[PDB]
Structure formats: C-alpha cells, structure tokens
Amino acid sequence: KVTMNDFDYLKLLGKGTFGKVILVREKATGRYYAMKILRKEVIIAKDEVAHTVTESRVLQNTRHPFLTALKYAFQTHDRLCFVMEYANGGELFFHLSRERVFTEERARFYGAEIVSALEYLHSRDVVYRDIKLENLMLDKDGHIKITDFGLCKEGISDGATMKTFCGTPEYLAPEVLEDNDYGRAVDWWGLGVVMYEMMCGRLPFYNQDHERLFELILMEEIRFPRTLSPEAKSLLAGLLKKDPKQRLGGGPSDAKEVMEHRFFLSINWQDVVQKKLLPPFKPQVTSEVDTRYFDDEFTAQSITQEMFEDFDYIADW
Amino acid sequence: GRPRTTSFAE
Numbered sequence: 001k002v003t004m005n006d007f008d009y010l011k012l013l014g015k016g017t018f019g020k021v022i023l024v025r026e027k028a029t030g031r032y033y034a035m036k037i038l039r040k041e042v043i044i045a046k047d048e049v050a051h052t053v054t055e056s057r058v059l060q061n062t063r064h065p066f067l068t069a070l071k072y073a074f075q076t077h078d079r080l081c082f083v084m085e086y087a088n089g090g091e092l093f094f095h096l097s098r099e100r101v102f103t104e105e106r107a108r109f110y111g112a113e114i115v116s117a118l119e120y121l122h123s124r125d126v127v128y129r130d131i132k133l134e135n136l137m138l139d140k141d142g143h144i145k146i147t148d149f150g151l152c153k154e155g156i157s158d159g160a161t162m163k164t165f166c167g168t169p170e171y172l173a174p175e176v177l178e179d180n181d182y183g184r185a186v187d188w189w190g191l192g193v194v195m196y197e198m199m200c201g202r203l204p205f206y207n208q209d210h211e212r213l214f215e216l217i218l219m220e221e222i223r224f225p226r227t228l229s230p231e232a233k234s235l236l237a238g239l240l241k242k243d244p245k246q247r248l249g250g251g252p253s254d255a256k257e258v259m260e261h262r263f264f265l266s267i268n269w270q271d272v273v274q275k276k277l278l279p280p281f282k283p284q285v286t287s288e289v290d291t292r293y294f295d296d297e298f299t300a301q302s303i304t305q306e307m308f309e310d311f312d313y314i315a316d317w
Numbered sequence: 318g319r320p321r322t323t324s325f326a327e
C-alpha cells in the first residue's frame with residue numbers, strides 16, 4: 001500500500017488543467033520519480049474518468065524502453081497519483097525550441113525510437129493519438145520516453161477504427177478533421193509532424209485560429225527547405241500524406257513500412273529497442289534534482305471507488 | 318519557437 005507520505009515533493013515539472021507533475025523522492029529507497037497528481041473532484045465533474053482509467057490500464061499493461069513505465073498508481077480520498085519513471089532530460093519541445101532545428105542524424109535517432117515505441121503500442125492494440133513534442137521526453141541517457149497516455153484507445157487491431165475527436169489541434173491528422181471514423185495510421189501522421197518540426201524547425205501547418213489551422217491541415221500542401229536531403233523530403237511527404245491509405249505506415253504492414261523507408265536505411269531496428277546506439281545528446285544534469293531541462297515557468301513554482309476499480313497498481317520492477 | 322500546445326477531447 002502506497003500513500004502521499006511515502007514521498008518527498010521537490011519540484012513542479014509540469015502542470016495541465018487536469019493535474020500536475022511533481023519531481024518526488026521515494027523516502028524508503030532514495031529513488032526519484034515523476035508523480036502525476038490529479039484531483040478526483042475535477043476528474044469526475046469534467047468527465048475525464050474514462051481517459052484516466054485508460055492511461056492507468058495502458059501504463060499497467062505496457063513495457064518498452066521508449067515508454068515511460070509506471071512504478072505505482074494509488075489513490076487517496078481526493079486524488080489519483082501515477083508514480084512514473086522520471087525523464088531528467090525534459091521534453092523534446094524544450095530542446096528543439098533552444099536549438100531551433102536538429103540535424104537529420106539526430107532527428108533520425110529520435111524518429112527511430114518513436115517508430116519502435118509506436119510499433120510496440122500498435123502490437124498491444126493501442127493507438128496513441130497524441131504524438132507531439134511536449135509528450136516526447138528524454139531520459140537521463142538521451143533516449144526517448146513517450147509520456148501522457150490519456151488519449152490512447154485500446155483494443156484497436158489491424159483495420160479497427162475510432163470515432164473520438166481528440167489529440168492536439170496542430171497535430172491532428174486530416175482524417176480526424178473529417179466526419180466518421182479513423183484508423184491507427186493517425187500515429188504516423190503525428191510522427192511526420194514531429195519529424196518535420198525536428199528537421200525543418202517549424203510546424204508544417206500553423207495558424208492561431210483553429211478554423212484556419214484545420215483548413216491548412218486538410219487542404220494545404222507542405223513545403224520543404226531546399227537543402228533537406230531527398231530521403232528526408234520523401235519520408236516527410238510519405239508520413240504527411242493526407243489520405244491515410246496512401247500514407248507511409250498507412251498500409252497493412254503499419255510500422256514496417258516506415259522502418260523500411262530509405263530515410264531509415266542506416267538503422268538496425270533490432271538494435272534500436274536494445275539501446276545499443278549512443279544517443280546524439282546526453283542531458284548534462286549535475287544531480288537527480290537538477291531540473292535545467294524543464295521550464296522555469298514550472299520549476300520556480302512552489303508546492304504547498306468503483307469508478308476507479310482498475311486504477312491502483314504496483315510494478316514487478 | 319511555437320507556443321505550447323494543449324491536448325483535448327470532445
């Protein structure tokens with residue numbers, strides 16, 4: 001049994017509407033984790049129960065080096081807490097904003113890890129649906145860790161479809177902006193957007209007004225920098241194909257199509273998951289409490305069932 | 318250097 005009192009609460013790492021993430025130390029072990037704390041009252045009143053139970057189930061039933069693992073999930077009378085592996089290197093969003101653009105080789109390393117994580121997810125019948133720079137963290141070694149599983153859909157195999165209008169606006173696949181249902185190829189669209197941001201230094205489609213933004217996504221052709229390699233242009237054009245049936249990854253073989261693309265020719269896929277590749281950037285933290293890869297905006301801030309049947313959990317690691 | 322984005326569901 002796990003309680004709030006089993007932890008020291010050190011720094012705010014992130015803060016959504018529906019909760020906050022705090023850097024915590026487990027007192028008995030001296031180990032550090034990221035705790036997501038949600039308020040039950042808010043979760044219930046705002047109809048976020050299904051998403052929260054889904055994130056719990058997904059985290060309970062996945063194990064992969066490029067997904068953040070769940071150590072403990074527990075509840076109190078007014079809170080739900082997820083204790084997860086702490087990604088010390090912060091969000092890819094942090095890094096890309098600092099550096100403006102990544103080399104193709106650096107984007108390839110991250111892209112390959114994301115492809116492996118997506119492959120694994122789809123193999124567990126999970127569609128992730130929210131690939132974006134904020135949800136892609138770096139661990140202490142510089143490997144990708146996908147976080148935030150609340151928008152996942154489970155039990156999606158092969159060509160099964162989904163109906164919920166969800167994700168993040170700037171990253172929505174064109175089929176999601178049409179009526180009716182969509183399949184798992186939405187995840188390859190999201191990879192293409194993040195890859196495009198990594199190698200081109202901006203979103204492929206952007207407007208502050210969601211009506212204009214969604215028009216661009218549906219109707220505008222993407223542009224490439226003249227000096228992007230032909231293989232990177234081809235990868236991006238393939239993942240950002242508007243028709244999911246023509247999209248790279250959109251066919252029956254799903255991730256395999258992406259892994260086979262010439263952009264990834266140099267990648268040994270069997271080695272990606274075994275983490276034999278030296279990452280192109282190791283976070284230079286000087287302590288487990290060093291939050292230099294997280295925004296001051298958050299880290300400066302001080303920190304003063306039936307329905308939830310499938311929630312609680314203790315890992316076998 | 319885009320603004321931070323927000324996930325949603327309807």
Ligand SMILES: NC1(C(=O)NCc2ccc(Cl)cc2)CCN(c2ncnc3[nH]ccc23)CC1
Pocket residue numbers: 013014015016018019020021034036037038068084085086087088091134135136137147148
């Ligand atoms: N990208 C993160 C974030 O801020 N997401 C927004 C957010 C905040 C709260 C809630 Cl309830 C939902 C979304 C993901 C969670 N955090 C992490 N930072 C470091 N290591 C981590 N491991 C797992 C999560 C996490 C902090 C960074």
